[PDB]
Amino acid sequence: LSPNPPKLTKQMNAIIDTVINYKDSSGRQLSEVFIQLPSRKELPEYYELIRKPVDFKKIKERIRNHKYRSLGDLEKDVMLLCHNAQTFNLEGSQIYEDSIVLQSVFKSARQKIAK
Amino acid sequence: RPVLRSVNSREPSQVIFCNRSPRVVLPVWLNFDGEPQPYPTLPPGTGRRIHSYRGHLWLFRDAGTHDGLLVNQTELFVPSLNVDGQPIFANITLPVYTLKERCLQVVRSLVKPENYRRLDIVRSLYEDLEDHPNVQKDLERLTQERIAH
Amino acid sequence: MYVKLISSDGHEFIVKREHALTSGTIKAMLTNEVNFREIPSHVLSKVCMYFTYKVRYTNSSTEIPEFPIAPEIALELLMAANFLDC
Amino acid sequence: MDVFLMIRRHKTTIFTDAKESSTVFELKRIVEGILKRPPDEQRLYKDDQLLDDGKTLGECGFTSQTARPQAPATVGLAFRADDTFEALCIEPFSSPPELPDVMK
Ligand SMILES: Cc1ncsc1-c1ccc(CNC(=O)[C@@H]2C[C@@H](O)CN2C(=O)[C@@H](NC(=O)C2(F)CC2)C(C)(C)C)c(OCCOc2ccc(CN3CCN(c4cc(-c5ccccc5O)nnc4N)CC3)cc2)c1
Ligand code: NA
Ligand code: NA
Ligand code: NA
Ligand code: NA
Description:
Radius of gyration of chain D: 15 Å
Shape of chain B: globular
Order of helices and strands of chain D: EEHEEHEE
Distance between the termini of chain D: 39 Å
Number of strands of chain D: 6
Shape of chain D: globular
Distance between the termini of chain B: 18 Å
Structural class of chain B: alpha+beta
Subcellular location (chain A): Nucleus
Family (chain A): Belongs to the SNF2/RAD54 helicase family.
CATH architecture of chain D: Roll
Domain Bromo (chain A): 3-113
Organism (chain A): Homo sapiens (Human)
Largest sheet of chain B: 4 strands, mixed
Strand content of chain D: 25-35%
Number of domains of chain D: 1
Helix content of chain D: 10-25%
Strand content of chain B: 25-35%
Protein name (chain A): SWI/SNF-related matrix-associated actin-dependent regulator of chromatin subfamily A member 2
CATH topology of chain D: Ubiquitin-like (UB roll)
Oligomer: heterotetramer
CATH superfamily of chain D: Phosphatidylinositol 3-kinase Catalytic Subunit, Chain A, domain 1
Bound molecules: ligand 87A, sodium ion
Number of helices of chain D: 2
CATH topology of the largest domain in chain B: Immunoglobulin-like
Largest interface: C-D, 34 and 25 residues
Number of helices of chain B: 3
CATH class of chain D: Alpha Beta
């Protein structure tokens, strides 16, 4: 487990920062609830359903520790976060709608920072 | 697992909470283990379309005093599935309190709890004033009612 | 159809039997006249208004208004309500 | 719809309801059913003003907003004796005590 080049870690961090810092037109940070999973004691129901839990804390850690070897590997963990939130909280929940917007903000940020 | 709980249906249900009381309302959700959770408050006359699930148990209190309120003329609210995307409506009102209970509410609202035993009243009413309304009290009563189907 | 409730100062209140029966105490004591040696007129009139309010709004579909109580009658009204079991 | 009244004379208070659309005369008939005095033995008042028999309770100023179950409007009642109407006399209710210090 050897280090990614500096320019790739600079790319990854700037994409995730955009997603995390994104505010909507009302002025609300959509990432807020996605920073940190609830614990298995708080909400066992989440862990009976979701096989591969992940939050933005873990995604920032996986950047620091060079576990993502491509912008592609990063996207997969973010899409997974957003799909887990969609699977658990179903269509019709604010948190499902928030996760959809964040998928879009991610792809939009990676399109700008891969230029 | 207690008698009064939400079930983990994972079946979405759109609900409108409407406060037609002169109280600030605290919606209270019973979780999968019967434990009441507080949700954001509704000022008098306000309503909100909110997302819930089939078989999720709700009840409604004065946000300041925990005085109990009705929803569609009963104490518990449980959504069906929406038929054809129609939201379920929850009409939140005052009950008809007993006069005794309404008098306790007004004295409690005008007198700091330290000063309750400084009022010139029948002494048995000091205990009644201190027995503040709460969800856990009413939860146990509603549970006993359900035990008798 | 109607019963007489008499306050301590000798005010007579003619209310519907069905409305008076809101009071557990009154419901037991019922003849058609009821003498209250310890509830005065400014309290007993307000009790009668609670009876009207209760029968009107119990099991209604119209919005229910708050039953108002002035600070100055609240303590007496409490003791009345406590004695009258309503 | 419904208006909620206290009909008051001397130390007698009748709690009754009626319709906004019902007449002062129909109220006298309610009183006659209770106190066995005929309409022509009754004067009804609102705040010292004599109510005409043919007028509706709504027309006299008794509305759903001013005559509520929890705050009924007052109708004054005076009876005839020896072919003379008494002065309208409503005995006040008792006064509450001084508001205690601990209730502000
Ligand atoms: C505006 C308003 N005025 C008056 S009332 C009101 C209102 C009404 C409703 C609502 C919202 N509706 C509800 O809460 C509904 C009502 C009831 O039916 C339960 N209920 C659920 O949603 C539940 N869900 C379910 O049963 C399922 F989802 C199908 C299985 C449950 C509570 C278990 C969540 C509302 O919202 C305000 C805010 O309300 C909350 C705020 C914070 C918390 C505490 N926790 C909860 C878990 N949580 C999550 C994290 C992640 C995640 C994190 C990191 C990475 C990935 C992730 O996936 N994902 N999902 C989560 N749920 C974090 C916060 C709870 C409520 C206001
Ligand atoms: Na997750
Ligand atoms: Na559920
Ligand atoms: Na839902
Ligand atoms: Na009430």
